[PDB]
């Protein structure tokens, strides 16, 4: 049998890399590849995606996002068309947690953890530096709601809830009241998670209230470090980063490897049916689709460039690698590593906010 897979990349060098990867894969039943470029608007993107589907009846679609604004404007139409035809779609560089709800996007996978999955590193950091009190500060949105829900579910084991959760509206010009209220409850460790363009206002406001002095400890995610959020930021802010969140060659190699292994494994079964080959003519489903997703979910890869690869029943990768870095004198520097296990510290002494080198107690 001859089965081919399709992808929607962002350039031509990525297309050449995909062709080389599939050429190396088929040299280890022949498979080909098909590629297309992104479009400014969603509707033409979706119709072109289903036209590409009808062209060769692609078993799976490898989608990716470019370094472009609007965030979730590029990967939505492909997911909607796939959900119309119930064919698997594998994402590469989509970090948002809206797609993690397995009710509206039944056919979707991720090669990178979502933005809301960086809630365990904070737990381990508190368990290592002996901090038991936090002040959660989030924006009123789906991302913040999911992050706070996951954090409280994780923290419910110790039967010690967060001291307070402060939700602020997404997009404003004065957040002075919330910070003034949260300044003096009882706690020092502040955990922030919001949009960078909204976190800049919080950073500017916190400087006027003298809350960035000695003693207080800050913690952030990844959106508060990149972008323009470095204009206003107190030194000593501890942040997290993904080790291989930008180099897409390794991601495409791992994705093509796992897809090839899955397509090799499925064909050994029986009672299969080819997916529909028309975006226009056919108005039916691809019944032997969920079985492919189920056999792909447990596709425990042996080894690769990005380490071991696995999956959960949520369309998210496990066993991620995180780097814990500190901002010293407007210059980032890595200070620790986290490999799913306990956090391993490096040979560098961090600088806590306000100067001085001594682990703050965090409680008054």
């Amino acid at each position: 049998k001859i089965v081919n897979i399709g992808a929607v990349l962002s350039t031509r060098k990525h297309e050449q890399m995909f062709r080389e990867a599939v050429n190396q894969a088929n040299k280890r039943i022949q498979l080909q590849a098909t590629s297309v470029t992104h479009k400014p608007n969603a509707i033409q993107m979706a119709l072109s995606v289903c036209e590409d589907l009808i062209s060769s009846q692609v078993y799976a679609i490898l989608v990716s996002h470019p370094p472009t604004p609007n965030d979730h404007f590029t990967p939505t139409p492909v997911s909607y068309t796939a959900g119309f035809y119930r064919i698997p779609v594998l994402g590469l560089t989509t970090r948002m947690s809206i797609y993690s709800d397995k009710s509206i996007h039944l056919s979707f996978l991720r090669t990178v953890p979502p933005y809301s999955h960086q809630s365990s590193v904070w737990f381990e950091m508190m368990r290592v530096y002996n901090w038991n009190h936090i002040i959660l500060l989030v924006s009123d949105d789906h991302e913040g709601r999911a992050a706070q829900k996951r954090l409280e579910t994780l923290l419910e084991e110790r039967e010690s809830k967060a001291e307070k959760v402060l939700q602020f509206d997404p997009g404003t010009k004065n957040v002075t009241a919330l910070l003034m209220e949260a300044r003096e409850l009882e706690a020092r460790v502040i955990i922030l998670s919001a949009s960078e363009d909204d976190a800049a206002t919080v950073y500017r406001a916190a400087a006027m209230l003298d809350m960035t002095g000695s003693g207080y400890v800050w913690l952030v995610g990844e959106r508060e470090i990149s972008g323009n959020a470095l204009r206003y930021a107190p030194d000593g802010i501890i942040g997290l980063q993904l080790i291989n969140g930008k180099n897409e060659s390794a991601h495409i190699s791992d994705a093509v490897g796992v897809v090839a292994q899955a397509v090799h494994e499925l064909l050994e079964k029986e009672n299969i049916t080819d997916p529909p080959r028309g975006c226009v003519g056919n108005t039916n489903i691809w019944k032997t689709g969920p079985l492919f997703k189920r056999v792909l979910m447990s596709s425990k890869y042996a080894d690769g460039v990005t380490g071991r690869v696995e999956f959960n029943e949520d369309g998210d990768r496990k066993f991620a690698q995180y780097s814990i870095m500190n901002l010293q004198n407007r210059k980032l520097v890595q200070v620790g590593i986290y490999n799913g296990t306990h956090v391993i510290p490096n040979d560098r002494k961090i600088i806590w906010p306000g100067g001085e080198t001594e682990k703050p107690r965090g409680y008054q």
Partner: antibody
Amino acid sequence: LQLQESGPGLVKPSQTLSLTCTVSGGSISSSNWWSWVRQPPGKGLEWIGEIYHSGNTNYNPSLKSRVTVSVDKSKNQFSLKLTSVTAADTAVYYCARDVSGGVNWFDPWGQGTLV
Amino acid sequence: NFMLTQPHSVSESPGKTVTISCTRSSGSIASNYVQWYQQRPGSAPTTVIYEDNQRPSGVPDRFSGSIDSSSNSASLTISGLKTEDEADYYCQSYDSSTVVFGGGTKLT
């Protein structure tokens, strides 16, 4: 607070550099940073690296594995230990202090040392 | 790292206003603003412009700073030129990696 350049002031090639700053009127144990900006003759400027008072010293990617900066509070001075300097690195070296604040601000500078 | 470009050989009669534009080579000056230092022949450089809007205590009010965000450059304006303005002016910036100094200009 006032600082002046010091050191042995050698010009021989294929050796190691060693020179220390002065800083009188200030305290090494503080919340500032000390830089070692280097000025080549007849050209622009080039930053070398800063050093915090207690434990950690930043650097520059180019000469990252060829230079070393040390401090000593007992003698109230910090010194530069450039290694494997060739004959193409002739320049006049400055001693610079920067205020932490929120940004970099290399002021006040030093008198400068010929090299 | 990146590079900085500055105009060269700019001078005129006293009493005029001159704008010197220090331009980013690659990227955008929007997350890390620049500063302007001045140097006297035979003397150590001294800062005159910091955060492009503020001035150090005792500095003359003739000099001023401005931003454009269009050509990715910072402008330093000198009004009422005097015989003591002949010096070397350097623009200095930084990023998330390091600190790099500009080429600099001379004013006669």
